[PDB]
Amino acid sequence: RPRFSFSIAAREGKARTGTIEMKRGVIRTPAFMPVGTAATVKALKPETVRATGADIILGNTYHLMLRPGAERIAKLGGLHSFMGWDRPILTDSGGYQVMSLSLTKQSEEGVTFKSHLDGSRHMLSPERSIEIQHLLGSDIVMAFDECTPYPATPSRAASSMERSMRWAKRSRDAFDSRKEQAENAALFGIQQGSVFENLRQQSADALAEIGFDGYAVGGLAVGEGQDEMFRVLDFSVPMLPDDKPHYLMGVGKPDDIVGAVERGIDMFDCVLPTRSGRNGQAFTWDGPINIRNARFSEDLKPLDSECHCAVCQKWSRACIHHLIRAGEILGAMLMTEHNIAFYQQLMQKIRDSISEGRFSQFAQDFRARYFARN
Amino acid sequence: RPRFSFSIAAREGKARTGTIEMKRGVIRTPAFMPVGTAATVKALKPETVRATGADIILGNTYHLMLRPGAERIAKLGGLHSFMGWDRPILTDSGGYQVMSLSLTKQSEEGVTFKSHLDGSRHMLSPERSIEIQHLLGSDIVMAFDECTPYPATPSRAASSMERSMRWAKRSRDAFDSRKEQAENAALFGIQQGSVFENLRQQSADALAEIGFDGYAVGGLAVGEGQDEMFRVLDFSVPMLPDDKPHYLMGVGKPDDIVGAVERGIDMFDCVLPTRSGRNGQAFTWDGPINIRNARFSEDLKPLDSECHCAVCQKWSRACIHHLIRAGEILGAMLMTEHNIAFYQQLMQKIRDSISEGRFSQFAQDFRARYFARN
Ligand SMILES: [Zn+2]
Numbered sequence: 001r002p003r004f005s006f007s008i009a010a011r012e013g014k015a016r017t018g019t020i021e022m023k024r025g026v027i028r029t030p031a032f033m034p035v036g037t038a039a040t041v042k043a044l045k046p047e048t049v050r051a052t053g054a055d056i057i058l059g060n061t062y063h064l065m066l067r068p069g070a071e072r073i074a075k076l077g078g079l080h081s082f083m084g085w086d087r088p089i090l091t092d093s094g095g096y097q098v099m100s101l102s103l104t105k106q107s108e109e110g111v112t113f114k115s116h117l118d119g120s121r122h123m124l125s126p127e128r129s130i131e132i133q134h135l136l137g138s139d140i141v142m143a144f145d146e147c148t149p150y151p152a153t154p155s156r157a158a159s160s161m162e163r164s165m166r167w168a169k170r171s172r173d174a175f176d177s178r179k180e181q182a183e184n185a186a187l188f189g190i191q192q193g194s195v196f197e198n199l200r201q202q203s204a205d206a207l208a209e210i211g212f213d214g215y216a217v218g219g220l221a222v223g224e225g226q227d228e229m230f231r232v233l234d235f236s237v238p239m240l241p242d243d244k245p246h247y248l249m250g251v252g253k254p255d256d257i258v259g260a261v262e263r264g265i266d267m268f269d270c271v272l273p274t275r276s277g278r279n280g281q282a283f284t285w286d287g288p289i290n291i292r293n294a295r296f297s298e299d300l301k302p303l304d305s306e307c308h309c310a311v312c313q314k315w316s317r318a319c320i321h322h323l324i325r326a327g328e329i330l331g332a333m334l335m336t337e338h339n340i341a342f343y344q345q346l347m348q349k350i351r352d353s354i355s356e357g358r359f360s361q362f363a364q365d366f367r368a369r370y371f372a373r374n
Numbered sequence: 375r376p377r378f379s380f381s382i383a384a385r386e387g388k389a390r391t392g393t394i395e396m397k398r399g400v401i402r403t404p405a406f407m408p409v410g411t412a413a414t415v416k417a418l419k420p421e422t423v424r425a426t427g428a429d430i431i432l433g434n435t436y437h438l439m440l441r442p443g444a445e446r447i448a449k450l451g452g453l454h455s456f457m458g459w460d461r462p463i464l465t466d467s468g469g470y471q472v473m474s475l476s477l478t479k480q481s482e483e484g485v486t487f488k489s490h491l492d493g494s495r496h497m498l499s500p501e502r503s504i505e506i507q508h509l510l511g512s513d514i515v516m517a518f519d520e521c522t523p524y525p526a527t528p529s530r531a532a533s534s535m536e537r538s539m540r541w542a543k544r545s546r547d548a549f550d551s552r553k554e555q556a557e558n559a560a561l562f563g564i565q566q567g568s569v570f571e572n573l574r575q576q577s578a579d580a581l582a583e584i585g586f587d588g589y590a591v592g593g594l595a596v597g598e599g600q601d602e603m604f605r606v607l608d609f610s611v612p613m614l615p616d617d618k619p620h621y622l623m624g625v626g627k628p629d630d631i632v633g634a635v636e637r638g639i640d641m642f643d644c645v646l647p648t649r650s651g652r653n654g655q656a657f658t659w660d661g662p663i664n665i666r667n668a669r670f671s672e673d674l675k676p677l678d679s680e681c682h683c684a685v686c687q688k689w690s691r692a693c694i695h696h697l698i699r700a701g702e703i704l705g706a707m708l709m710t711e712h713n714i715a716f717y718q719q720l721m722q723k724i725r726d727s728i729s730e731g732r733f734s735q736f737a738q739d740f741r742a743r744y745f746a747r748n
């Protein structure tokens with residue numbers, strides 16, 4: 001019923017659990033958002049993704065505007081039809097992929113780039129990104145920003161942050177200028193500032209002055225290492241409005257997530273569970289495992305003996321091992337389904353332990369078992 | 375190089391091993407002929423069937439003339455193109471399926487029947503069957519005959535046998551009337567006579583007077599039981615010309631085959647390995663097994679610990695068990711591949727043991743292990 005309503009059911013330190021209510025459904029916080037595809041035989045079925053625990057999936061604006069393009073998606077009935085997913089959908093701005101996959105020109109106005117598979121010209125800006133995310137019909141909209149490469153100078157970081165904040169205002173204005181969008185969707189602002197506390201602070205209150213439904217912590221997961229990331233999060237998150245969801249984009253190693261929840265993050269997304277699913281890496285409570293190893297050739301146990309997913313209730317490491325080695329598609333599908341389910345179960349344990357006030361103990365128990373392997 | 379050349383490399387009693395040389399390839403005797411399909415994703419690949427040991431496959435004329443029809447097959451380049459199989463292909467007359475799946479009218483002239491899936495009219499006769507098998511471009515041609523249902527009266531059996539012999543002559547004449555066919559393909563005659571020794575004898579020399587490249591023993595595998603079948607074969611086979619291949623149509627239980635080789639049979643065909651492959655039954659040296667049983671849920675051993683097929687060199691009973699239970703298509707494919715390979719390996723053991731003069735001992739060793747299960 002509500003456009004966007006964020007509640008906090010419980011807290012423990014900086015960590016916090018709750019829900020985000022939207023017209024297309026409820027999102028349980030902290031949340032992991034798997035990346036959606038297009039609902040074909042090559043990808044997992046929508047109902048399968050839903051059955052893993054996903055309350056909301058993510059769509060890459062950049063790839064979607066390249067193929068089959070935002071206009072086609074709109075004619076087809078939006079992303080929800082295209083992806084066969086009738087629950088909330090978040091779309092990124094498409095700016096990150098542009099500055100790492102494409103740029104014929106860049107300025108304060110925006111960027112124009114060539115299609116890395118067609119050569120055709122495409123333009124992106126705060127105004128255009130908002131419009132494109134509208135055509136896709138997403139529920140949560142990400143503001144268009146300028147991402148600064150890692151490592152970055154204190155000058156290049158301050159420059160890109162200052163621009164990203166002006167683009168934040170432009171994104172907000174574009175969003176509000178469209179009644180169908182502004183009254184039904186939500187808008188998140190992104191905080192930049194690299195590893196510099198002053199830039200982070202100047203970015204945070206700049207966004208707060210503009211006002212957003214949610215606030216993303218951008219600039220991380222670019223190769224800074226976990227320790228540096230936690231150190232950044234340590235001061236970055238408290239500068240963000242407490243009564244709004246905190247989104248940490250791109251971050252999604254299981255231990256990265258737990259540590260980020262300890263520091264106030266409410267939302268996560270990454271392609272790691274999907275990517276490593278096809279590459280033969282499975283996530284367990286005792287750390288990641290490579291299924292191709294000869295050890296799992298006759299291992300009758302499931303991928304994880306505590307995972308509740310439909311794969312672990314049926315398939316053993318042995319059969320999954322062979323399917324993967326045989327090049328059989330089913331094997332990669334099974335791995336992927338488990339991986340994203342495992343992630344959702346991690347989220348559920350986090351939510352549970354917070355509301356019971358036992359999350360601090362869970363975080364310690366988690367790392368102890370996860371890092372020890374075996 | 376030769377149209378049809380049958381050699382006997384070795385004998386042991388009534389049993390005999392050798393080769394059939396044809397323009398499209400050599401057929402090792404005794405031989406099992408699996409039933410071909412149409413080379414699609416639903417059926418095993420031609421190269422897979424070849425890799426199991428098959429020197430020749432069988433095509434059902436009746437089904438092929440119904441869909442997509444013999445004329446279409448001819449335009450497509452014949453059965454070899456249609457099935458993606460460039461080695462010898464035997465086609466049945468199509469008469470058996472007619473009298474058990476279709477008959478609007480029946481007489482000495484022939485039969486006309488309605489398509490059991492289109493209602494359309496189709497006509498079959500000694501002349502028409504030969505022509506249709508020509509359109510399909512098969513290498514071994516079966517003479518059109520009238521099959522007598524089981525059990526049959528001594529009158530109905532004598533009647534159908536006498537007709538089948540007149541149709542044998544008509545089949546031979548049609549075959550010889552077509553130069554492209556007569557000079558490149560082979561023709562087999564079928565012996566009828568039910569369980570009656572006099573009718574069998576009167577049928578045998580009737581065929582010998584006509585003369586055929588090979589001689590089939592028809593009228594069995596209609597539900598007479600193994601013991602009655604062996605009893606029939608005991609006198610039926612020696613009445614057939616010794617210097618020609620002996621074909622036992624429809625028969626193909628592993629123990630039925632071994633016993634039939636002991637009585638002089640050189641060729642076999644049946645859908646049992648293909649049918650039970652999809653139904654979850656696997657053939658082993660210790661008898662058939664039902665893969666759906668809970669016992670095989672964690673059985674790390676292959677289907678048969680002596681089978682050389684690619685499935686048993688990789689897949690365990692456990693993984694095959696799950697695939698079948700999951701309804702996964704791969705499971706039924708694996709079972710089928712093993713089953714037809716197991717059959718070819720049985721044939722190879724028969725050929726080997728005969729030429730070494732140890733087949734009588736092999737037959738005893740086979741039954742002892744096969745019937746004891748375990
Ligand atoms: Zn699992």
Ligand SMILES: [Zn+2]
Nearest residue numbers: 681683686712
């Ligand atoms: Zn096998």
